Design a protein around this ligand. Structure first.
Ligand SMILES: [Zn+2]
Lengths: 241, 99, 111, 94, 49, 173, 49, 49, 107, 181
RNA sequence: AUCUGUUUGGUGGAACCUGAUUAGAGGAAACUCAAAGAGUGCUAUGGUAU
């Protein structure tokens, strides 16, 4: 479909920092912060502007859950140019690097990861992207890395642990700005495999309310993934009513 | 097409005067000047008139498809409304028999 | 002519009403004309309401309230043949008297 | 379809024009007549609207566009094909 | 009966794709973009009231 | 050259912004839940999570049907009853006459759900929850609420009738 | 203004006791701590904050 | 008062004199403001005056 | 730029009507009015995808229309479809009318 | 005034500097604007006339129904108002209160009638031609744009003979004859 | 080609019908003059005043 020499009409998406490449097939793309290279072997699009050569990175929904959220039609993403974002569970630059593209040079992305092996590729990516601050630490103890993180406008949680409601909450209290963004991706099997996927999603939503995070929206990620839903919420300390 | 008699056409109000554009016979100078790109453009322009002819016909048939199913559904739908209407009458007899 | 003059309570604006009907509201110090009506009628006197934004003019038979730019806002049908006007600032009342020998108090805020 | 044989709902085929009259053309059926009648009535209705508008015209109507628009000697309105070149412009074109 | 219920079910799977997206195994070959295109101004998402 | 057709300037009610009436002046199509196969809720499996309505508690006491046990009889499965804050508020608001209905509704076996909306109208709170997760049973005997729930597809509806509970749209029974 | 701003109720402590409350005691040294009892025989220690 | 409060059997004062804790037999322990029109936030000097 | 190069103008016109390009595709329904800010870009393939998703240099062109016309399967398809449409549009028009008025003449 | 905060608004509920109850919804301004009335008290001088009609109609109402005097005068009142063109129908007596309005009088002004007779594009443009001395009613030129035209005299409303407007009309259709002018 | 006449694009916008609006609808300029709305920045610091 999108072969090497094929050329596309690139036009902006509804969300700031996201672009659509048209053609015989449509591709979600974000502008490359570090032109001339691919972090995980995605396709890249070059446009000649007056002439400098800018480069766009293809966002594959099947590899990045957030991308699958766009394509299904999330109404509100708190990620946008010039916003500080905290990414929990950054396995590697498959999805953080795309998030760094959206925020742009002005914004920053705090990628948090625990396991050392995938981290090593996170750090090597981070050198190419100045606006990414990789934090190789456990998300279950935010106190350990409090020196490194300021207020963050949005907190994105891709962490695959059974007790997500605690990690997202604890980092939300310390670092999320009031009225700030929260985006959580929930995998039904990981939290509790004994009960159906719908029950788990209802359970996680209730935990967020108890933690003062008014949830705005839930989307299921099919066909891109099975038993996944992305819940978008706002952190309302004043009152969730 | 419809041809209005000229007598009627002459005495028409200003709001409704039919614009009948006569053909031109004397060759206009611009018509004798304009350069029409030949060769590679010609094959690349006939194709555009090829594609748009398919596209309108595709839409004009799928649009006619909808109008075919629209007629069938509303006929089906009016039948349920009739049942919903006639059976509603009976309840208000059954209810107000008590009252 | 003749011209009846009333200043604002703060001295920032001047309201002049020619007898034959030239009403002008202006900032006399900086020389900016806020509004200028040429009512083809007899105007008897005028006053500034709570601030320079609004003013009232006593025309041939009725009083009219105007905006800063000269748009009329209300026609006070009740006040007939008003000859003199005054505005109580703290109470937000407009007072009138004239040939009828009736003293009418009108509240600008509630109308 | 309740209490009806499939034999009852049998297609009745449609006849054709006689060979002796084949020159004249296709034999008009009811369906093709209805198209002829509907189109004629649609056109006559517009003429009846245009005639009454002609009869009810007020000769004193004035529209600012009466200066720009022009009328032919017959009286039928003249519309420009595409909506005179100055000497300087023609010099550049030549 | 068995052959009919076999055919009824497979038809139902075809309609279910029209009603909603259904997982179909994921990724086959290089990612060739969105097959049928993406709509910028539409959100298929369920809003918390 | 004074213009022709001059007219006195006046306030225009229709177009003037300062007036309050003139001052005031991404389509969404919700996805059909993945848990739903036409009218069949495939996701729902035992044990069942169930939302209780205020009328359900009152009638249950009339018929001498214990909540936890009487339910386990109807579905032949473990049921995890859930009472929302709205339902709890309505019970308390009823008055001293219904103090027993309050005491049973506080039985520790009955878990409670927090809520995040100002009003205490429980009918709308339940209807929102069922629309958004197709993972709850609705236990209510109110005529109005039942009709709303029936329109929602894939939502089992439970009621107290006769001497014991009845479940309507729960195929696994 | 005093009447429109008179909003005395702030909230309730947790989910309450199973039975009626009949004994309330304060930690006269700590500002935000409160101990309650009920006819159920239950006693609870609260964090009012 | 409140429709949900049924027999006040215990009432006390927070040690800062700002809040009222009451216990009824419906089983809830409520908090109230000592002065309804007041608010707990730190007031600017222009508010205070 | 306001020039709106005919190559770019035709380029966008093939994306407005991309439903009719290939009879097996059948995208979603959308309007896609021309945006006020857009650019034209060329894809870059990964070196690991040399055999899978790489066009030969000769096949690459400056315009999409050139790439589309270059194919012979698509080119043959339109000629069949368009010829079918012309028959439908030309049926019963002035041409057919003259024949019916011609046969009425003895020869 | 700045947009009032909430606490202010509760304490200042009736305050409105731009709309008052005596204004009666600015029906005066609305009806001057639609039909382009220039003299301010034209609306109210009409408003007294409609009040006179309505008052008379009520007093006729309270009289007994079969009363021959009630028969005659209400027929007379409708026939006169219908002839003046204030009333479009003479069938119902109830129209005397429901369908007698200032706008019913304003629609018979010369600027409005020319607009209905298509002699102008808009009421504003109809007025300008009156003040320019293009419009005649009978052989009398009229510069007053408040001239009320009875139903009968709507027929003699016409351009002035030498008017440049008639020259454009006749020139547009190529029907200009300079002998007449 | 005093051949043929459908299609694509441009030009023009009769009648009927539908919707909105109406002292007709627009346009351009600015170190211009006004009346409002939203957002943002600024130690924005007397819990009781050297
Ligand atoms: Zn609730």
């Amino acid at each position: 479909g999108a072969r090497g020499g094929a050329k596309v009409v690139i036009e902006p998406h509804r969300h700031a920092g996201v672009y659509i490449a048209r053609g015989k097939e449509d591709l979600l793309v974000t502008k490359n912060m570090a032109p001339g290279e691919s972090v995980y072997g995605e396709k890249r699009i070059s446009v000649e502007e007056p002439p400098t050569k800018v480069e766009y990175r293809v966002w594959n929904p099947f590899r990045s859950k957030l991308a699958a959220g766009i394509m299904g039609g999330l109404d509100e993403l708190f990620i946008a140019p010039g916003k500080k974002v905290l990414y929990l569970g950054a396995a590697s630059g498959t999805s953080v690097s795309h998030v760094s593209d959206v925020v742009g040079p002005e914004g920053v992305v705090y990628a948090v990861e625990f396991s050392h092996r995938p981290g090593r590729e996170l750090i090597s990516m981070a050198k190419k992207r100045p606006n990414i601050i990789p934090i190789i630490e456990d998300a279950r103890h935010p106190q350990k890395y409090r020196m490194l993180i300021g207020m963050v406008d949005c907190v994105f949680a891709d962490v695959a642990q059974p007790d997500q409601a605690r990690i997202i909450a604890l980092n939300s209290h310390m670092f999320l700005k009031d009225q700030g963004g929260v985006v959580i991706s929930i995998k039904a099997n990981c939290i509790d495999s004994t009960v159906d996927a719908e029950t788990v999603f209802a359970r996680e939503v209730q935990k967020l309310r108890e933690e003062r995070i008014k949830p705005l929206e839930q989307l299921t990620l099919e066909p891109y993934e099975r038993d996944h839903c992305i819940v978008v919420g706002r952190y309302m300390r004043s009152g969730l009513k | 097409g419809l041809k209005v008699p000229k007598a009627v056409q002459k005495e028409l109000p200003f709001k409704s005067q039919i614009h009948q554009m006569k053909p031109q016979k004397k060759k206009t100078y611009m018509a004798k000047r304009a350069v029409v790109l030949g060769g590679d453009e010609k094959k690349a322009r006939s194709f555009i008139q090829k594609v748009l002819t398919i596209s309108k016909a595709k839409d004009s048939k799928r649009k006619e498809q909808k109008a075919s199913q629209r007629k069938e559904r509303l006929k089906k739908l009016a039948k349920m409304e009739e049942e919903k209407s006639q059976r509603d009458k009976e309840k208000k007899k059954e209810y107000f028999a008590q009252n | 002519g003749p011209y009846h003059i009333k200043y604002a309570k703060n001295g920032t604006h001047l309201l002049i009403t020619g007898r034959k009907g030239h009403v002008a509201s202006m900032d006399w110090r900086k020389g900016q004309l806020r509004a200028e009506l040429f009512l083809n009628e007899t105007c008897h006197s005028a006053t500034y309401l709570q601030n320079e934004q609004y003013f009232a003019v006593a025309q041939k038979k009725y009083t009219f309230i105007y905006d800063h730019e000269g748009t009329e806002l209300h026609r006070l049908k009740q006040h007939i043949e008003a000859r003199h006007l005054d505005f109580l600032p703290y109470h937000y009342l407009l007072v009138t008297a004239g040939e009828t020998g009736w003293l009418k108090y009108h509240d600008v805020s509630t109308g | 379809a309740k209490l009806v044989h499939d034999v009852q709902k049998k297609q009745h085929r449609e006849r054709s024009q006689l060979t002796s009259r084949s020159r004249y053309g296709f034999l008009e059926k009811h369906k093709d007549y209805v198209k002829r009648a509907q189109d004629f009535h649609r056109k006559q209705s517009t003429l009846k609207v245009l005639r009454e508008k002609a009869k009810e015209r007020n000769p004193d109507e004035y529209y600012h566009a009466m200066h720009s628009r022009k009328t032919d000697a017959k009286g039928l309105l003249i519309s420009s094909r595409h909506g005179s070149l100055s000497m300087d412009q023609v010099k550049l074109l030549k | 009966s068995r052959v009919k219920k076999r055919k009824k079910y497979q038809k139902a799977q075809k309609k279910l794709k029209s009603v909603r997206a259904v997982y179909s195994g994921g990724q086959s070959g290089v990612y060739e973009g969105e097959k049928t295109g993406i709509k910028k101004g539409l959100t298929r998402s369920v809003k918390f009231k | 050259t004074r213009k022709f057709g001059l007219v006195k300037r006046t306030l225009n009610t229709k177009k003037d912004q300062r007036l309050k009436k003139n001052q005031e002046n991404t389509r969404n199509i919700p996805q059909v839940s993945s848990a739903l196969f036409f009218q069949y809720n495939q996701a729902i499996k035992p044990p069942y999570q169930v939302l209780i309505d205020t009328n359900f508690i009152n009638f249950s006491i009339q018929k001498k049907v214990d909540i936890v046990r009487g339910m386990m009889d109807c579905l032949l499965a473990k049921c995890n009853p859930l009472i929302t804050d709205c339902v709890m508020a309505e019970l308390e608001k009823l008055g001293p006459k219904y103090r027993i209905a309050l005491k049973l509704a506080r039985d520790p076996r009955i878990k409670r759900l927090s809520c995040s909306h100002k009003g205490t109208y429980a009918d709308d709170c339940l209807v929102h929850r069922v629309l958004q997760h197709k993972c709850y049973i609705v236990a209510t005997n109110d005529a109005g609420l039942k009709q709303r729930i029936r329109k929602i597809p894939g939502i089992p509806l439970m009621s107290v009738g006769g001497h014991a509970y009845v479940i309507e749209k729960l195929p696994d029974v | 203004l005093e009447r429109m701003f008179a909003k005395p109720f702030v909230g309730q402590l947790g989910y309450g006791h199973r039975d009626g409350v009949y004994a309330i005691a304060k930690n006269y040294g700590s500002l935000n701590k409160l101990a309650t009892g009920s006819a159920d025989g239950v006693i609870k220690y609260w964090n009012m904050s | 008062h409140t429709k949900r409060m049924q027999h006040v059997f215990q009432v006390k004062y927070s040690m800062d004199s700002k809040y009222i804790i009451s216990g009824s037999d419906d089983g809830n322990v409520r908090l109230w403001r000592s002065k309804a029109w007041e608010r707990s936030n730190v007031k600017t000097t222009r508010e205070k005056n | 730029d306001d020039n709106m190069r005919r190559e770019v103008q035709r380029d966008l016109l093939l994306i407005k009507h991309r439903a009719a390009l290939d009879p097996k595709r059948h995208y979603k329904k959308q309007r896609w009015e021309v945006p006020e800010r857009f650019a034209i870009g060329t894809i870059i393939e990964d070196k690991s995808e040399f055999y899978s998703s790489r066009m030969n240099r000769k096949e690459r062109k400056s315009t999409i229309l050139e790439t589309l016309m270059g194919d012979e399967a698509s080119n043959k398809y339109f000629k069949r479809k368009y010829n079918e449409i012309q028959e439908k549009s030309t049926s019963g028009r002035k041409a057919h009318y003259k024949k019916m008025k011609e046969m009425r003449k003895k020869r | 005034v700045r947009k009032l905060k909430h606490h202010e608004q509760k304490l200042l509920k009736k305050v409105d500097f731009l709309e008052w109850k005596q204004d009666q919804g600015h029906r005066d301004t609305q009806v001057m604007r639609t039909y382009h009335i220039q003299n301010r008290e034209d609306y109210h001088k009409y408003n007294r006339i409609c009040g006179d009609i309505r008052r008379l109609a009520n007093k006729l109402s309270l009289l007994p129904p079969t009363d021959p005097f009630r028969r005659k005068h209400e027929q007379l009142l409708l026939d006169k108002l219908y002839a003046m063109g204030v009333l479009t129908t003479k069938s119902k007596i109830s129209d005397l209160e429901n369908k007698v309005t200032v706008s019913a009088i304003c629609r018979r002004r010369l600027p409005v009638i020319m607009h209905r007779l298509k002699m102008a594009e808009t009421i504003q443009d109809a007025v300008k031609f009156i003040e320019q001395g293009h419009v005649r009613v009978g052989p009398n030129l009229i510069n007053d744009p408040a001239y009320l035209v009875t139903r009968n005299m709507e027929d003699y409303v016409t351009w002035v003979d030498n008017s440049k407007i008639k020259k454009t009309l006749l020139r547009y259709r190529n029907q200009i004859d300079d002998f007449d002018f």
